[PDB]
Design an enzyme around this catalytic site. Structure first.
Site, PDB file in Angstrom:
ATOM      1  N   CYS A 196       0.826  -1.204   0.000  1.00 52.76           N
ATOM      2  CA  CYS A 196       0.000   0.000   0.000  1.00 52.76           C
ATOM      3  C   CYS A 196       0.864   1.260   0.000  1.00 52.76           C
ATOM      4  O   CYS A 196       1.484   1.576  -1.020  1.00 52.76           O
ATOM      5  CB  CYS A 196      -0.968  -0.037   1.186  1.00 52.76           C
ATOM      6  SG  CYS A 196      -2.441   0.984   0.953  1.00 52.76           S
ATOM      7  N   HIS A 224      -0.386   1.510  -3.499  1.00 58.44           N
ATOM      8  CA  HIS A 224      -1.760   1.963  -3.616  1.00 58.44           C
ATOM      9  C   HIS A 224      -1.821   3.053  -4.684  1.00 58.44           C
ATOM     10  O   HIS A 224      -0.880   3.847  -4.810  1.00 58.44           O
ATOM     11  CB  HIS A 224      -2.274   2.498  -2.281  1.00 58.44           C
ATOM     12  CG  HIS A 224      -3.758   2.681  -2.242  1.00 58.44           C
ATOM     13  ND1 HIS A 224      -4.379   3.827  -2.689  1.00 58.44           N
ATOM     14  CD2 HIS A 224      -4.747   1.858  -1.820  1.00 58.44           C
ATOM     15  CE1 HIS A 224      -5.686   3.705  -2.540  1.00 58.44           C
ATOM     16  NE2 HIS A 224      -5.936   2.519  -2.014  1.00 58.44           N
TER      17      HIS A 224
END
Lengths: 188, 188
Positions: free
Chosen positions: A105, A125
């Site tokens: 992420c 992400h």
């Protein structure tokens, strides 16, 4: 003959991205140490889940080496990882001894801060892409899990299971990952 | 005008099945209380993740009512839930006021122990099916998430995201669930 994993837990970390890999890795028989960046004290994660680490990062540093170092995401968690000199030392050492580094992420942005794995293909992400690509030091991928050399990255909370099973496959092989996967009732 | 969720956390609970719904529900603006069955003290989950609850179940009981009561899985966690008279009281009250009850994996077996929702269609982890079906008081489903009346059940750790988003959809509607889902990078 037991593999060892270091999970670095800082305030603001994404608790799902922390617990899923820890859980899955321990299901695979890996000895996991959840190390608090700021010490042994409980860590308030991004959605206010409070997790008690197994040890301080200072103490865990002395019990290396680790076959994988895991950096959870969470915007504020990743920022704290990026600012820590202790994290820089651990990651550079892991890179030199060609150990696995895994981040998910926003976690991969700590690799840029510490100048780790330049030239590798990485994913983040979508909201962290611009930050990761500042300077063009990596090549960006949109794969849910990406592994280039010793750098393993993943995109978000919803990829945490695939992220964790990829770590297991790298450490313990494809058969163990498949055995651990079946009781989880994953879709694919 | 804020919905409230009660998550009952007992020793041996599956930490992934606890953190994912708590996290996702708080992303949806739901006020979640993680209540320790045995008190305020930290709870060692099935894979040794240690979580600090927000309150004791005794104190959380007095701050009801809750729009959803959530029972995580974990074999030993579910057994502790099944043996607790305090859990029986909370669940029966929730059933009488027609509030939502949600349980995942082995968690649904606590509903049988406390005689909750007989006649409903339910699902469990495959390894918990025989236990849940002792007596034929429910109808068994193999759906990853099952909702019959006020009883919402799910199968395992790998269904936790769908389980949590189903709770959000029931409480806050389909649009909020979709908005919360997108940043997670779920596959489907």
């Amino acid at each position: 003959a037991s593999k060892r994993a270091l999970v670095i837990l800082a305030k603001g970390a994404e608790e799902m991205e922390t617990v899923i890999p820890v859980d899955v890795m321990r299901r695979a028989g890996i000895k996991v140490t959840v190390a608090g960046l700021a010490g042994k004290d409980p860590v308030q994660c991004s959605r206010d889940v409070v997790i008690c680490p197994d040890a301080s990062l200072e103490d865990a540093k002395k019990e290396g080496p680790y076959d994988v170092v895991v950096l959870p995401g969470g915007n504020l968690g990743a920022q704290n990882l990026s600012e820590s000199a202790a994290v820089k030392e651990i990651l550079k050492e892991q890179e030199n001894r060609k150990g696995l580094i895994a981040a998910i992420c926003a976690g991969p942005t700590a690799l840029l801060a510490h100048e780790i794995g330049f030239g590798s293909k990485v994913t983040t992400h979508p909201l962290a892409k611009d930050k990761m690509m500042n300077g063009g030091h990596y090549t960006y991928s949109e794969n849910r899990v990406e592994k280039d050399g010793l750098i393993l990255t993943s995109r978000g909370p919803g990829t945490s299971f695939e992220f964790a099973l990829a770590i297991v496959e790298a450490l313990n092989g494809k058969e163990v990952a498949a055995q651990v996967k079946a009781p989880l009732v994953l879709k694919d």
